[PDB]
Amino acid sequence: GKIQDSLSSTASALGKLQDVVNQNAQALNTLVKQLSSNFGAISSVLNDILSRLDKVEAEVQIDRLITGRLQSLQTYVTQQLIRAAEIRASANLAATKMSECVLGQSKRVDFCGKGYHLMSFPQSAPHGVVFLHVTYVPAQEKNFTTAPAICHDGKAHFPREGVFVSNGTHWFVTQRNFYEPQIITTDNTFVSGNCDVVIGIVNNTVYDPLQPELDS
Amino acid sequence: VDCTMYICGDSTECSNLLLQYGSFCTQLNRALTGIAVEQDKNTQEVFAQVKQIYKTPPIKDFGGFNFSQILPDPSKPSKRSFIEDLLFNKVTDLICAQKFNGLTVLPPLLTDEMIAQYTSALLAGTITSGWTFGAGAALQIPFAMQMAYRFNGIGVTQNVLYENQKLIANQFNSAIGKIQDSLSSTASALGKLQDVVNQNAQALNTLVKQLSSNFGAISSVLNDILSRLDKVEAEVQIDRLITGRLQSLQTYVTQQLIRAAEIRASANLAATKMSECVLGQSKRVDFCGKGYHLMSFPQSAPHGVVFLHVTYVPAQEKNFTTA
Amino acid sequence: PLSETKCTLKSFTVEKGIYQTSNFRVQPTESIVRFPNLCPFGEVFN
Amino acid sequence: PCSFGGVSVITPGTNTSNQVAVLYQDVNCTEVNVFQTRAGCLIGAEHVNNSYECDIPIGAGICASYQTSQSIIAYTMSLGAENSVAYSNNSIAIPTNFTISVTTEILPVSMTKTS
Ligand SMILES: *[C@@H]1O[C@H](CO)[C@@H](O[C@@H]2O[C@H](CO)[C@@H](O)[C@H](O)[C@H]2NC(C)=O)[C@H](O)[C@H]1NC(C)=O
Ligand SMILES: *[C@@H]1O[C@H](CO)[C@@H](O[C@@H]2O[C@H](CO)[C@@H](O)[C@H](O)[C@H]2NC(C)=O)[C@H](O)[C@H]1NC(C)=O
Ligand SMILES: *[C@@H]1O[C@H](CO)[C@@H](O[C@@H]2O[C@H](CO)[C@@H](O)[C@H](O)[C@H]2NC(C)=O)[C@H](O)[C@H]1NC(C)=O
Ligand SMILES: *[C@@H]1O[C@H](CO)[C@@H](O[C@@H]2O[C@H](CO)[C@@H](O)[C@H](O)[C@H]2NC(C)=O)[C@H](O)[C@H]1NC(C)=O
Ligand SMILES: *[C@@H]1O[C@H](CO)[C@@H](O[C@@H]2O[C@H](CO)[C@@H](O)[C@H](O)[C@H]2NC(C)=O)[C@H](O)[C@H]1NC(C)=O
Ligand SMILES: *[C@@H]1O[C@H](CO)[C@@H](O)[C@H](O)[C@H]1NC(C)=O
Numbered sequence: 001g002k003i004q005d006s007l008s009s010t011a012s013a014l015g016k017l018q019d020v021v022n023q024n025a026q027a028l029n030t031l032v033k034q035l036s037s038n039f040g041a042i043s044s045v046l047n048d049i050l051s052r053l054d055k056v057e058a059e060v061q062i063d064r065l066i067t068g069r070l071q072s073l074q075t076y077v078t079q080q081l082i083r084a085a086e087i088r089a090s091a092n093l094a095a096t097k098m099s100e101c102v103l104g105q106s107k108r109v110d111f112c113g114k115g116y117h118l119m120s121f122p123q124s125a126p127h128g129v130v131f132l133h134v135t136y137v138p139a140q141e142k143n144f145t146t147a148p149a150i151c152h153d154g155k156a157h158f159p160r161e162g163v164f165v166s167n168g169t170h171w172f173v174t175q176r177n178f179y180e181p182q183i184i185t186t187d188n189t190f191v192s193g194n195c196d197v198v199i200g201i202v203n204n205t206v207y208d209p210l211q212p213e214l215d216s
Numbered sequence: 217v218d219c220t221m222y223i224c225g226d227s228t229e230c231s232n233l234l235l236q237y238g239s240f241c242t243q244l245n246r247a248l249t250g251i252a253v254e255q256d257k258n259t260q261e262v263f264a265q266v267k268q269i270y271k272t273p274p275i276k277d278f279g280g281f282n283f284s285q286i287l288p289d290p291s292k293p294s295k296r297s298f299i300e301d302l303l304f305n306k307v308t309d310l311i312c313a314q315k316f317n318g319l320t321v322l323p324p325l326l327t328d329e330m331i332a333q334y335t336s337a338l339l340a341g342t343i344t345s346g347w348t349f350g351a352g353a354a355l356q357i358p359f360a361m362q363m364a365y366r367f368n369g370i371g372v373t374q375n376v377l378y379e380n381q382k383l384i385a386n387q388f389n390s391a392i393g394k395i396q397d398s399l400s401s402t403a404s405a406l407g408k409l410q411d412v413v414n415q416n417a418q419a420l421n422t423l424v425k426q427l428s429s430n431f432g433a434i435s436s437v438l439n440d441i442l443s444r445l446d447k448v449e450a451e452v453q454i455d456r457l458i459t460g461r462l463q464s465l466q467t468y469v470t471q472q473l474i475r476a477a478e479i480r481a482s483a484n485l486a487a488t489k490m491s492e493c494v495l496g497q498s499k500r501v502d503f504c505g506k507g508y509h510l511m512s513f514p515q516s517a518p519h520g521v522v523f524l525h526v527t528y529v530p531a532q533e534k535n536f537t538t539a
Numbered sequence: 540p541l542s543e544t545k546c547t548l549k550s551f552t553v554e555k556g557i558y559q560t561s562n563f564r565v566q567p568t569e570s571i572v573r574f575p576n577l578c579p580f581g582e583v584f585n
Numbered sequence: 586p587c588s589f590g591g592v593s594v595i596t597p598g599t600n601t602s603n604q605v606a607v608l609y610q611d612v613n614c615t616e617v618n619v620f621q622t623r624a625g626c627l628i629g630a631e632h633v634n635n636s637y638e639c640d641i642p643i644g645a646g647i648c649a650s651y652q653t654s655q656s657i658i659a660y661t662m663s664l665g666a667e668n669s670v671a672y673s674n675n676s677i678a679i680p681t682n683f684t685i686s687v688t689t690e691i692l693p694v695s696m697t698k699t700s
């Protein structure tokens with residue numbers, strides 16, 4: 001919904017497009033106005049030089065028009081080439097996003113826009129394209145004492161995925177980017193080495209799934 | 217660059233004629249302004265991607281990783297990493313003559329002391345908060361744990377780091393020390409930057425020398441053509457001056473536009489690396505440099521940026537029968 | 540100096556921002572002419 | 586040769602005000618309220634200490650904004666809002682909750698084809 005008003009209530013969001021369209025219409029105006037410049041010739045109307053003057057001299061005059069105008073095209077043309085080469089670069093950026101962001105899911109941080117990227121929705125705009133990036137931004141934090149590892153029997157247990165935390169009493173393994181505390185069991189942790197090495201390893205008891213299943 | 221003053225030195229005799237070429241005077245300013253406007257957009261997106269200016273805690277225990285080289289030097293008046301100052305030495309009156317013909321060098325919107333806050337913040341965020349500050353609110357996480365992730369990013373199970381932590385520290389710390397020795401005697405590694413600064417002053421020089429050229433007219437001094445001849449002749453000569461100089465601008469200008477885009481693409485690459493390499497961990501191969509990538513530390517440099525890519529390179533191999 | 544910029548944008552609406560109006564120059568106060576043998580009129584006339 | 590520089594008319598939108606603050610670029614302030622800067626000689630905007638986020642860039646990190654009645658001000662550009670992450674070797678911060686933001690991103694693709 002707010003995307004509507006973001007566009008609806010402000011006209012500067014599209015400046016990128018608006019700048020492209022202007023600069024094109026800009027140089028055209030300039031290119032046209034160059035027709036009315038003397039360029040050292042007696043007048044900017046090509047016929048007046050022919051009307052007033054006998055041709056043999058008017059030849060030299062029309063040069064200053066031609067040399068002026070003919071140059072004035074190369075100025076305009078060169079601008080377009082340079083400017084198109086920018087668009088050509090921007091086009092690939094789109095075609096890259098369109099392929100990676102829209103068609104796939106991007107792992108490139110802040111290529112699709114701030115946050116973890118979920119999906120993108122292309123939308124056309126005049127001589128341009130507009131993407132709606134649906135991104136995942138975490139919100140509310142809770143300070144947790146953490147430990148990189150947990151001694152159980154003297155073996156070390158490291159989180160298979162995510163990390164260990166505790167709120168200060170019970171140690172919880174959890175996934176990184178969202179808080180879902182889970183009791184620590186060997187299916188959450190793989191053993192490696194032993195205790196004396198890992199810095200900051202802490203004591204706890206890693207519950208066994210299997211052990212309770214036994215006793216009967 | 218002021219066309220009116222550059223082409224026609226402070227003299228209306230030439231100023232009148234320039235009116236006949238129309239927008240050639242103005243549209244150059246529009247072109248140059250078009251460059252100089254975005255020149256700060258480059259520095260904008262490259263260095264400031266960060267919402268807030270972080271600063272490291274007062275005390276550093278990173279597990280033996282000594283960043284006191286890369287962190288801002290608290291004692292220097294401009295707080296800049298010990299490394300950055302090496303750069304500002306290696307990169308480097310000319311401005312006065314330029315300043316005198318209408319060639320002005322506007323100030324970069326962000327002073328070096330400001331850049332050094334960004335490249336401090338990004339660098340101070342990456343240390344403490346992991347990568348999560350690019351995706352949202354920075355999350356303090358033990359650095360020695362942050363590495364236990366960035367290995368999972370390269371496929372090395374984290375149980376390697378907690379066990380090898382010390383050995384990785386010295387390998388990191390020493391590898392830092394090698395950097396500062398390199399810069400201490402290396403003029404070339406900055407060749408990319410040093411070239412860019414050169415090529416501008418080059419074309420800037422050449423732009424100036426073109427004020428001394430006859431261009432076919434009887435002299436390259438504007439007034440000395442006047443006071444020699446009666447003006448109805450000077451109107452003819454001053455053409456060959458203007459036609460010459462006006463061209464020499466459009467050469468220089470059209471250069472800058474091309475050269476600007478060259479930096480433009482480089483600036484986009486810097487934003488891509490700043491975004492992906494520093495704020496993330498790049499799965500892309502050899503985008504952040506040879507080896508699997510762990511993290512990057514940006515460092516400002518004059519009209520540029522310098523990343524320190526920390527990459528994980530395997531070493532000793534043993535032939536194994538496999539199935 | 541405000542009216543001369545609106546002539547650069549050609550618009551009566553001037554968008555928030557900084558615009559570059561025509562340059563200014565400092566102008567000269569005065570001319571300074573400076574010139575550094577001797578003819579033997581003390582040797583001819585005296 | 587006598588100093589010269591581009592006049593820069595700093596203005597909020599003509600919408601909000603008719604008041605302008607002129608910046609003479611790269612001159613010491615004589616040859617002209619006056620405030621000397623790193624960028625040039627800035628006329629018509631009272632200096633301000635307390636620094637805010639940038640509004641109208643000028644140069645050397647000097648950003649001018651309209652508000653305080655009101656008069657155009659100028660101040661050293663503040664970079665973001667300061668934060669110092671509370672950090673310690675056992676301290677981790679896990680987000681418990683998220684938001685889903687939709688962010689428009691706008692790109693040119695083609696330009697008007699002219700011949
Ligand atoms: C940390 O979280 C754990 C998980 O909920 C808490 O352990 C439980 O706390 C509730 C609190 O009402 C008790 O009713 C349960 O009996 C506790 N579980 C067990 C197995 O004892 C723990 O209290 C929390 N600690 C803090 C400081 O927040
Ligand atoms: C984790 O708990 C173990 C005990 O299960 C602690 O090991 C003791 O460490 C002290 C300190 O050197 C020794 O004096 C004891 O002899 C150890 N216990 C045994 C049974 O040998 C270990 O220190 C604890 N870890 C932490 C970080 O406190
Ligand atoms: C980080 O490295 C810096 C220098 O690379 C160390 O600072 C030096 O400390 C020694 C003491 O061991 C002094 O003799 C030197 O004069 C210091 N040099 C400088 C330039 O300050 C610093 O101690 C190291 N700290 C850590 C935690 O590794
Ligand atoms: C991995 O390689 C490193 C060297 O890169 C080894 O560390 C060195 O070990 C020797 C002992 O043989 C020490 O004398 C050196 O001081 C160590 N270097 C450093 C930088 O600490 C390490 O032993 C190797 N480990 C394995 C398993 O091969
Ligand atoms: C996660 O955050 C969302 C919003 O950021 C919370 O959604 C709100 O939940 C309250 C319940 O206390 C409702 O009254 C609001 O209507 C919800 N907002 C919206 C926009 O739906 C959500 O409750 C949070 N989850 C947790 C577990 O705290
Ligand atoms: C965690 O502790 C720091 C200590 O300064 C504090 O700034 C931060 O707000 C705390 N986190 C929460 C969620 O309160």
Ligand SMILES: *[C@@H]1O[C@H](CO)[C@@H](O)[C@H](O)[C@H]1NC(C)=O
Nearest residue numbers: 199200201275277673674675
């Ligand atoms: C963490 O740092 C504190 C210093 O405040 C130190 O006392 C403690 O031993 C360290 N613990 C770990 C696990 O790094």
Ligand SMILES: *[C@@H]1O[C@H](CO)[C@@H](O)[C@H](O)[C@H]1NC(C)=O
Nearest residue numbers: 530531532533534535536537
């Ligand atoms: C593996 O075998 C090849 C056979 O040529 C040998 O050259 C190589 O050195 C062996 N690997 C090691 C680590 O020695």
Ligand SMILES: *[C@@H]1O[C@H](CO)[C@@H](O)[C@H](O)[C@H]1NC(C)=O
Nearest residue numbers: 555597598599600601602651
């Ligand atoms: C511009 O003026 C219009 C009314 O003419 C007003 O609606 C709008 O909010 C103004 N814009 C700003 C930025 O103050």
Ligand SMILES: *[C@@H]1O[C@H](CO)[C@@H](O)[C@H](O)[C@H]1NC(C)=O
Nearest residue numbers: 611612613614615621622623
């Ligand atoms: C301007 O001139 C004054 C003295 O007239 C001097 O104190 C000041 O440093 C000068 N500043 C610049 C930028 O020239």
Ligand SMILES: *[C@@H]1O[C@H](CO)[C@@H](O)[C@H](O)[C@H]1NC(C)=O
Nearest residue numbers: 620631632633634635659660
């Ligand atoms: C800033 O504060 C100093 C005192 O610390 C004062 O002398 C100066 O006038 C102030 N300037 C502004 C623009 O507030």
